[PDB]
Amino acid sequence: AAGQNVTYKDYGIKLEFEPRVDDDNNVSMRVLADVSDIDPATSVSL
């Protein structure tokens, strides 16, 4: 609301893995891969 609280935002290399394995060693997975850097061009001073 309103118009404070301070939170934190992660940047860098982020990786999340959730595997599942079969009897034949087949792998079913959900994978998140993120690469994010800071950009001076689109930063706002407030």
């Binding site: 609301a1 309103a2 118009g3 994010s36 950009d39 689109t42 706002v44 407030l46």
Partner: protein, 51 residues
């Protein structure tokens, strides 16, 4: 007293311009039958919005 005081002014224009822009984007993806895949190549900008 009977009279007149008047005149005209003018400007000259000879501006001429062109513009061309091209782009191709070729993303590619893989996903399993019944799954979902999301892909983003770009950036994030800060937006100041609140309840």
């Amino acid at each position: 007293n009977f009279g007149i005081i008047t005149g005209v002014l003018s400007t000259i224009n000879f501006a001429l311009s062109n513009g061309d822009a091209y782009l191709i984007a070729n993303p590619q993806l893989s996903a399993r039958s019944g799954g979902r895949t999301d892909f983003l190549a770009g950036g994030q900008v800060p937006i100041l919005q609140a309840l």
